[PDB]
Amino acid sequence: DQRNEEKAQREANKKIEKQLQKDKQVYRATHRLLLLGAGESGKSTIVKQMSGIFETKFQVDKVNFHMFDVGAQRDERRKWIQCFNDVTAIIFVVASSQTNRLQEALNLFKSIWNNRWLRTISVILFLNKQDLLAEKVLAKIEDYFPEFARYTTPEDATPEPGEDPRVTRAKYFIRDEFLRISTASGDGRHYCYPHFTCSVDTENIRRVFNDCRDIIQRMHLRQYELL
Amino acid sequence: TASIAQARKLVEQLKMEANIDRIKVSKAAADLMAYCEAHAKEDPLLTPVPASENPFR
Amino acid sequence: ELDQLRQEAEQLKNQIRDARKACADATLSQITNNIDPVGRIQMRTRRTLRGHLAKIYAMHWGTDSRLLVSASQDGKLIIWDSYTTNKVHAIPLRSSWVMTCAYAPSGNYVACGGLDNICSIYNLKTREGNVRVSRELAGHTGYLSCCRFLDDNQIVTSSGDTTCALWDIETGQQTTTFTGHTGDVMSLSLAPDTRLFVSGACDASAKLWDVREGMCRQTFTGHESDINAICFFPNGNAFATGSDDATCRLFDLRADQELMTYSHDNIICGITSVSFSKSGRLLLAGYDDFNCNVWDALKADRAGVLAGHDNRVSCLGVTDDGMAVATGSWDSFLKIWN
Amino acid sequence: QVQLQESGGGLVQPGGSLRLSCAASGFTFSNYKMNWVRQAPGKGLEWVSDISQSGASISYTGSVKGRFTISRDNAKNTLYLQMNSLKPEDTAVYYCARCPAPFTRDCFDVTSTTYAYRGQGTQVTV
Amino acid sequence: DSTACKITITVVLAVLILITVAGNVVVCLAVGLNRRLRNLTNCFIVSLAITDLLLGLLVLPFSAIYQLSCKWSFGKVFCNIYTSLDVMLCTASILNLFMISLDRYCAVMDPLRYPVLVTPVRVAISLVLIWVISITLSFLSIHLGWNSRNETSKGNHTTSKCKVQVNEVYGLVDGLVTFYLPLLIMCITYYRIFKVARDQAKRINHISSWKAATIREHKATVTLAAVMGAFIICWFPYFTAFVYRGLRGDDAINEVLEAIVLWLGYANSALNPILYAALNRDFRTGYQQLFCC
Ligand SMILES: CC(C)CCC[C@@H](C)[C@H]1CC[C@H]2[C@@H]3CC=C4C[C@@H](O)CC[C@]4(C)[C@H]3CC[C@]12C
Ligand SMILES: Cc1nc(N)sc1CCN
């Protein structure tokens, strides 16, 4: 009489497998993003333009993106963050605008970059609140980064036609300070994609889209020994 | 005075834990070894089980 | 007053250390020198369970030694019948960040939780065949960590907010809060008599807690880094804990001291899960090297190695009958070893 | 049991030197990257400097670069910090911190509020 | 020196057969033993290895003996089967290379749609279409006499010759369908992939200022050339000769050229296990695990 129990179990398994196939396709069609930075950085402004954890869903050119905003979690993030070793990218928001907040952001970035379970994920780096740094430098980097005294704007810089050089060199100094960490390791398995942005903008979604395109394209090119 | 408030609980916890009727480690070791030896025959992961009795054969 | 309290705390710590030293008459490694070794222990993968799409974070055996519940980062729990490898249930979850899952000792309910700080309890005994959330417990202020049923009406949870809680499932309220840890609480273990439990934290320490009184009965230390896994010795008189030091330690509750250390020169990776065999003679520990080593509790010598997972071994479990060991990993597969 | 003890401090003059010491007990010292982290009264915790496991990689903050020297002695099991050419803005409580995982390059929760792998610190007032 | 030549050619043919069989068996072992490689991405590579393996076991061992002996002693009913198997397997291998190229194009050009574009059902449909075309060309056409020139052919005195007959239509249709149009499509595909790869390499090398270039464009070009040069060098002259003799006639081509082009076509089955599996770092990981196991 156990034959009927076996048959019923097989039927239930078949139904579960059909549902799992549908869920597998849906899962594989979605890109997941981690959003870090919940301090002076305008993370909530970026979220608005785009409970332990909050989820935001959006679509760009019929591509589905699922961004995860960290909610009620303590300052200790060593064990928690290991949950995010499978995201396609980490979006790291640092305000470029009283302690050395920029040094703390650089230390957190360095920690994320060199973590055993995270050192395959590219980081999309948003250097936010560029206008507050523009105001401050035109009226404090040298007192926290003395090497900035010898920094010169580079040759591939693309400043706006109305940008004071004193703002250009500071923004590119900060960007280069992040790239100095990003470039020192990874063996090509991950790259940093820095961007300058205002607190309120509309191009952030497009920039994240393009950075995800570049990340996946570079991964595939690495797979085929074309890069 | 938050650190004083927390130290007032730390000292109480340490005082409470100090009053434990601890035994000699040799007695606990003997008890654990005796338990392990008594139930050794009942552990399939220590004594292999024939396929006719193993459900995962 | 702060300096006087600090000095009193130091004096009490010195007194406790002296009381512990007073009992160190011999080591387990000396008493067990006359005990025959377990020999070479070998196991083979008997079943492989597939169907998860992401990391498997938690796994728990049923009390009938035939059903398994596993949780993955897809947002799904899967209830398997291990004897046939068929899936019995698949439960979609509200959020995909699941770090723990638990099977009720009666088989009626399944609990889970994670980064949403909420422990969800699903009723499997559904008249319609549709598994629904029977309750949600939402009193923590940090990511939810290991949770274990005490009975159909009580559950003990731990979280990243440094506290543990005894919850009454009928009302959705906390009935006891256990405080005293300073770091995140990583794993729980319930005593076989369900009167005490032991909680390990990111303080490199563990605490023996009294369920009914809400007090911390004993504090054990000796690890250098965070404790990731903890389990009870089958008779309830000892713990085994694993940490990020690449070491495991057996502690005795009555001597209030560390009793044995299991470590190896070639192991520098952390321990993700710890469990005991039915007799307590074999200690199984899963490592980040994608492998699980089997140890001899009494003689502290490596006995056998379980190999086959191609990613970090997240969870380990032994059936109440002791017949099989289940292992989960980040490669989305479960393995049932003889 | 992991326990760190700081030594040194007191009232100092601007332009002087001071040697802070950190003694360890309860772990293997030569496997963890070591940190010095200060906290000013009225502000939060801020990271000063670090030295690696073997003592090769030494890094500082830009505000403290060229005036501080972090060293370690794995044989004598101690951590030293030399403070020459001081500044009146450097009056703070100093902590010697230990990274939680051995044999790694990343340190997450060093500059945090409730962290249990560092000592009680020492007061340096200029 | 005719016997020294015979012995040397025998050794060369045996070495080629052994290399083909060993390489394709190694690829199949890598996929079977390390189930981490079982992916939609690797199914075309697995199919290509098996096809080539069959050539090692079913066709080449007889082609080598016919060329050495110079007589088809096996028979006439077997001669129709040997000609069919050769056509089927060679066409299947070429079309598998074409599908690998198309899969890589889809992977690189639109990485955000790839998980949707190459759903497994489309892979199965593509493989079924490949095998339908191969069987249509190899068995349906041969047994129906579609490749036969006319009824004016008297044939050889006995069954000793066993060579694929080529009518004018068969040469132009077999060439265009199986090699030339796929060749054009693959060339365009890999040119576009090359452009994307070199642009990415330039960006990666340019973002670094104080750090020396971490990526070599010349090495990327070399990988693409090895992928295409092998295909063209192996297959172009054989189909050129095939199409030429279909129109002009068999009496026009010399026998040494007929042998050289046939064996150049066969040799491509000894390179596919290297170009596609040995250059894929997932298979290099598998080829460390295989010996580790
Ligand atoms: C990777 C490629 C180059 C390996 C294949 C090597 C090719 C060129 C080898 C394999 C079999 C060889 C043929 C074997 C039989 C003969 C008959 C002899 O009377 C003239 C040469 C000729 C026609 C040989 C030319 C070279 C040949 C076609
Ligand atoms: C004549 C012909 N046409 C193909 N597509 S293959 C083949 C045989 C290869 N030796």
Residue numbers in the entry:
A (entry chain A): 11 to 60, 205 to 251, 262 to 303, 307 to 394
B (entry chain G): 6 to 62
C (entry chain B): 3 to 340
D (entry chain N): 1 to 126
E (entry chain R): 13 to 305
What does the study report here?
The H2R‐Gs complex was assembled in the presence of a highly selective agonist, amthamine, and further stabilized by a camelid antibody, Nb35. Utilizing single‐particle cryo‐EM analysis, the purified H2R‐Gs complex was solved at a nominal resolution of 2.7 Å. In the H2R‐Gs complex, the agonist amthamine occupies the conventional orthosteric pocket of H2R. Specifically, the aminoethyl group of amthamine is positioned between D983.32 and Y2506.51 (we use the Ballesteros–Weinstein numbering system), engendering a charge‐charge interaction with D983.32— a conserved “salt‐bridge” also observed in other available monoamine receptor structures. Additionally, the two amines present in the thiazolamine moiety of amthamine establish polar interactions with T1033.37, D1865.42, and T1905.46 of H2R. The thiazole ring of amthamine is sandwiched between V993.33 on one side and F2516.52/F2546.55 on the other side, facilitating crucial hydrophobic interactions. Collectively, our structures provide a clear explanation for the high selectivity of amthamine as an H2R agonist. However, in the H2R‐Gs complex, a significant TM6 movement of 4.7 Å further outward than in H3R, as measured at Cα atoms of residue 6.30. In the H2R‐Gs complex, the length TM5 of H2R extends ≈2.5 helical turns (from position 5.67 to 5.75, encompassing nine residues) compared with H1R. Furthermore, the extended TM5 in H2R tilts toward TM6 from the Y2025.58 residue for an 18‐degree angle.
Histamine, a biogenic amine, plays a pivotal role in various physiological and pathophysiological processes, such as allergic and inflammatory reactions, gastric acid secretion, wake‐sleep disorders, and neurotransmission in the central nervous system. The histamine receptor system comprises four members (H1R, H2R, H3R, and H4R), all of which belong to the Class A GPCR family. The four subtypes of histamine receptors deliver downstream signaling by coupling with different heterotrimeric G‐proteins: H1R mainly couples with Gq‐protein; H2R primarily couples with Gs‐protein and could alternatively couple with Gq‐protein; H3R and H4R are both capable of mediating downstream signaling via Gi/o‐protein activation primarily. In this study, we report three cryo‐EM structures of H2R‐Gs and H3R‐Gi complexes at a global resolution of 2.6–2.7 Å.
